[PDB]
Amino acid sequence: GRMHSAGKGISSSAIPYSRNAPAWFKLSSESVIEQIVKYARKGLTPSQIGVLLRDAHGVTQARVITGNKIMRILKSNGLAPEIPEDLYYLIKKAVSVRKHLERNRKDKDAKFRLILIESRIHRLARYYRTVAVLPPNWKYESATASALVN
Amino acid sequence: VLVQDLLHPTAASEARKHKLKTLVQGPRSYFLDVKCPGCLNITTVFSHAQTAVTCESCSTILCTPTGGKAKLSEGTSFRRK
Amino acid sequence: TRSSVLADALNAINNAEKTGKRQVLIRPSSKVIIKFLQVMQKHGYIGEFEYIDDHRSGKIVVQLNGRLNKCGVISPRFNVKIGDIEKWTANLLPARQFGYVILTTSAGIMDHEEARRKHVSGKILGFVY
Amino acid sequence: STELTVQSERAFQKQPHIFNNPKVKTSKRTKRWYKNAGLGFKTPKTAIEGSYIDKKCPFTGLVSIRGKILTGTVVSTKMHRTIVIRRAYLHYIPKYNRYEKRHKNVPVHVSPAFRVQVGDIVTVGQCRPISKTVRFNVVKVSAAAGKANKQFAKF
Amino acid sequence: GKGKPRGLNSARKLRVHRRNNRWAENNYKKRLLGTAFKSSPFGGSSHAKGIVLEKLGIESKQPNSAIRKCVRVQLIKNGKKVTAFVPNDGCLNFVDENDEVLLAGFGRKGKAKGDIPGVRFKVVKVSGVSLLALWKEKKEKPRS
């Protein structure tokens, strides 16, 4: 594993065997959907909405309690972002490293890490263009990449 | 051992194993109803929260995130499920 | 990464059989694996096997009768004509009388003798003896 | 092609031996010849009710379709009324019992009854030599959706 | 996967790898370079003719100790100079100088024989007559 490292950690979630769950959840699907929508109004990404719903509330899996997954819900309600969440966070990291590099020219493993992050950005963006989420000829051009993530 | 029931292992052996490495993988985590020092409103808290979960009456804290299970805030009571 | 789930399954059975185990676990249990195991089962090379249903790809526990010498995969799945089945059996099988080369045909996954009497051909999956 | 400069060359463009009588004023002003190229290929309505000429068209021109029917992928629409398609195929090398990816580039005449974009899968039919390199006409296009319905600006 | 590619669609890679690695073989390299026609005393042929330039006494390699009785020959078709061993007890007397000689390789496809240093050809005929026939007295050299 670890596309850009020699790590081999496994460390994931083990979601339950039950697809209908969990027999102590008395809340309604539409109630969870509206809580998802207002978190998306507050500018939370689907990962953050799912974390909040699991900790603060008893939402084990939004796709289980509701009918479908969180990014699908937000896209249904017009709350989809311009670029996917994971692509946004990779571009954000590349921008942060690049602004570290402009002030630290000797930081060569920062330069090495920036190459890894940008390689991860281009592979992801290539996927998203193939499944037609990003428009074709969408490109991370690395000079005005601060525009689309801030 | 050379002959053993791989379809029906002991519950002690399964409980010993990693969550991903049991016969059917599943979570070792749970959910808790937590009663705050102030009010008797039911709030459900994940075991391995990652959120500093707060309530309405004691709108500061119920659990503190850790590297694993969250720790309750020293003034609450809790029940599993 | 995992490239052939059938190669992994047949390796696990081989390494279990060679060490003397009566049982072996297999993950992740494709249906090609299931059909391959059924062809081995109908010829007595394994015993009864179980499909465990996790909600991802399943697992299999196979029971072993000690009569399997070697089960293997042929990768890549070479295209096999009717008239070059016998050269695969010559290359792979210890004797002409026993042992089976498993093929996948539009008529289904089967051994080479069932392929001969149905007069069908396809790709090679593996062998068993 | 009712518009966009059908008569854009030094000679008057017309279908040979098709006569528009200046006297008898039938309410179309244009006799347009057309044919069905055959082999179950439907004549496009664009050919029927158009006004382009294209003597190399298989529906309104003099050419005919006979011989090989091939499929390909449009890789270039840069020439005028000519596309290049890419025909990939697997070539079997017996010694290794394996194949290698191989491709051919076919230059194909395309009638203005057809709109083709780089990426469209096209059915082409053999005709007589049109050019130095061209021996096929487009008889069918297979651009239905283009997977471009979800690649636009979002509010 | 023990190295080499195994995909059903890797025929190009396997055939090119074989092409690249056949240059490591002596025979394939020599044949495809055309070295016998280009860089070889006989221009790739089995035998050649030449004129005896001079008789040589070649001291054999150790641990042997002998004079090996070769001749310097200039090949008619090339002009190249070669050294050819004259095989038998005597038979150097039969060779003389300015005589035409038919030379052959010796059997080591190049690669000078035995204890004779740098000699890779042997005289088979002299003046159109077999050395074997001259040595066994079956025939005589044409004086005129």
Place this chain on the structure above:
RNA sequence: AGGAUAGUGGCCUACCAUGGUUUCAACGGGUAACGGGGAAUAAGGGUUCGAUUCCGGAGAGGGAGCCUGAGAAACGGCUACC
């Protein structure tokens, strides 16, 4: 679009457009390469060869050009040059 051809075609011409091939090896270089049917050896897979009894192609010292003819750019036809 025209010309030419037995006829299609940049085959050629005028005008116009900027195309066409290529790491799936284009372009170039080498070949002690005519191609194939085939041949030798070979458990199987392969390796090497095929100027040469049949099929196709090319040439008649090297080029080019042409006459007669249904048919030749013919060479036991012509013309010129080397």
Place this chain on the structure above:
RNA sequence: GGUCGGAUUUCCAACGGGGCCUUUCCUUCUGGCUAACCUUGAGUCCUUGUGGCUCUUGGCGAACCAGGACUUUUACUUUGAAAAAAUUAGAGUGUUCAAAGCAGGCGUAUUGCUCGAAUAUAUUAGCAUGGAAUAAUAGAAUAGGACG
């Protein structure tokens, strides 16, 4: 074994193909098929059987001809065909044998009779065909979806 251990056959078994039913596409409208006749007016003249019937009660006229409100593409494999002759393998034939060759053989040699000159393989590409496992590909998501 009624021909001095050799047909016959639901006694069947074992292989192999097809159709149908179980929620089950096998697209399609024009018209000649007139159902292994869905529905048995008239008739069960064979000493009893569930292996053999006649003009039929408008009778799903779906048992093939040439045109689509008609076509997801591809690899793979099956069969067929094509892959000149010679050659290769190989059938027949006492070239005295054999390499070969395609001959030859049998009479009533009195008026000629007759067997042959097979078959297979021939790789890839193209062509027709069955299959639908394997491996790709495509489909309804701002419904611009299908059914009608």
Place this chain on the structure above:
RNA sequence: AGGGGAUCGAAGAUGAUCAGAUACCGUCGUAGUCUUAACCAUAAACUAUGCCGACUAGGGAUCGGGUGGUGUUUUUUUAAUGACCCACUCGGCACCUUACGAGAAAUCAAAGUCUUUGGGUUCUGGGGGGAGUAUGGUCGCAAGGCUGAAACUUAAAGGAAUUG
């Protein structure tokens, strides 16, 4: 090319040793050693062991994270937390035993699951020299690096182990 230049110190000097000593040893000593801005791109750059995936044996120690003990320990006496103990678990640097198995052996839990030969994939080798030479190209200020033959020559070169 600047800066710095304590130290040690290719060069050089010098004192020894010895037949010689332009070497080892002694005392100095430029470059260098350090830094900044550029080059270079090579090491026995080594685990002489490509990467990804699966499986095959036992054990204890250890680093990081986690989970569980009406387990010790200090702090108010013990709460907790820390630290420690025990038991598990994931990941990691390794180690030990054995030889299933492998190997020519040395040895190796991978160098195993290989003539019972096919999980995916990249690179490289084809007797010893000539030779990493010559030539061309390309990179470099240079030193040099990358790519890289042939003619010719040769019966061995080599690996691991055994006895002496």
